[PDB]
Design a protein around this ligand. Sequence first.
Ligand SMILES: CC(=O)Nc1ccccc1CC(=O)N1CCC[C@H](C(N)=O)C1
Ligand SMILES: [Zn+2]
Length: 140
Amino acid sequence: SGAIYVGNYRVVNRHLATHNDWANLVWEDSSRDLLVSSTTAQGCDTIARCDCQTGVYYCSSRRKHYPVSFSKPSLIFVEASEYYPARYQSHLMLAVGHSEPGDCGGILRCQHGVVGIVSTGGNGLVGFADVRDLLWLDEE
Ligand SMILES: CC(=O)Nc1ccccc1CC(=O)N1CCC[C@H](C(N)=O)C1
Ligand SMILES: [Zn+2]
């Protein structure tokens, strides 16, 4: 589990969105596994606007933050899960790291801010949904 809290937005994995998220929806994209809802309180996270390919992510199944090298956002085939069939997910970045399904929502960050959230996982792989292109998260 986990979310990004920037401005008056809450960014979560679409497959983990709650009823309150759907009832206060701002934007969602199944191809990216992302959903954004509105919040009453202002958040403290800032979004990275950069081209970093190194950063650190939070792994809830180890209670640890790990430094990782990650690929550029791309269209990757992901195997079936209980939330989606086997399909192509867009704006996904892969790294070598520990991951389990409940680790979705953990933040990937660099020196500039938040880069994305854990969305997928393989044997010794972790995939992150990028948010750096979502410029509108910084306003309204
Ligand atoms: C075996 C493993 O590492 N599982 C793992 C770890 C961490 C997170 C997720 C998984 C499995 C996974 O990739 N998916 C299940 C949840 C929805 C994902 C999606 N965005 O399409 C696909
Ligand atoms: Zn950066």
